[PDB]
Amino acid sequence: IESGIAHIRSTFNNTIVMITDTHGNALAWSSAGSLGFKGSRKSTPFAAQMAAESAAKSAQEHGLKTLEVTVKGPGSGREAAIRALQAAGLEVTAIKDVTPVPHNGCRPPKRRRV
RNA sequence: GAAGACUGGAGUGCAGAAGAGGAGAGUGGAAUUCCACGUGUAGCGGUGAAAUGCGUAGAUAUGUGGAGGAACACCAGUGGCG
Ligand SMILES: [Mg+2]
Ligand SMILES: [Mg+2]
Ligand SMILES: [Mg+2]
Ligand SMILES: [Mg+2]
Ligand SMILES: [Mg+2]
Ligand SMILES: [Mg+2]
Secondary structure (H helix, E strand, C coil): CCECEEEEEECCCCEEEEEECCCCCEEEEEECCCCCCCCHHHHCHHHHHHHHHHHHHHHCCCCCCEEEEEEECCCCCHHHHHHHHHCCCCEEEEEEECCCCCCCCCCCCCCCCC
């Protein structure tokens, strides 16, 4: 409405972008798979470019001049989408890293190729 | 072998110090999974490439509460104790 927030999760397989309110309910979303990418083409920064553009440009109807980006996931598609959202008109107030680091909680799945 | 003597071995007392040494009872936070709720739309997941799999009974993402189990981020170092 006036100032929402943007959630992004660009893992090594996909880039999902979110736009919500400041109290945190969904408005519009897009993904690298929604644009027609089949193989591992999702993980590229360019697929994140199209996802970010198509998600920010569809947030115009809701109405938002400011937003903040919360970046989660270890993939290679964060800066691209952050810049694409910032360069569509809405200025990103601040950027945060929200990766879920555990304090040695539960054992991870076994190492690959053994 | 026997009878004595000594303190440089061994032990006791006195004054200090460090420590993931052991056993019993009780509390803490972050995170994974499950459950309920509010917008929320067509995909999510995964590989070198895919498919099986989950998803219009409406998933992923998304904020708010509840349950349970296991291991203890930084400190952390050919550091410490046995
Ligand atoms: Mg002595
Ligand atoms: Mg919890
Ligand atoms: Mg599982
Ligand atoms: Mg949920
Ligand atoms: Mg929760
Ligand atoms: Mg020793």
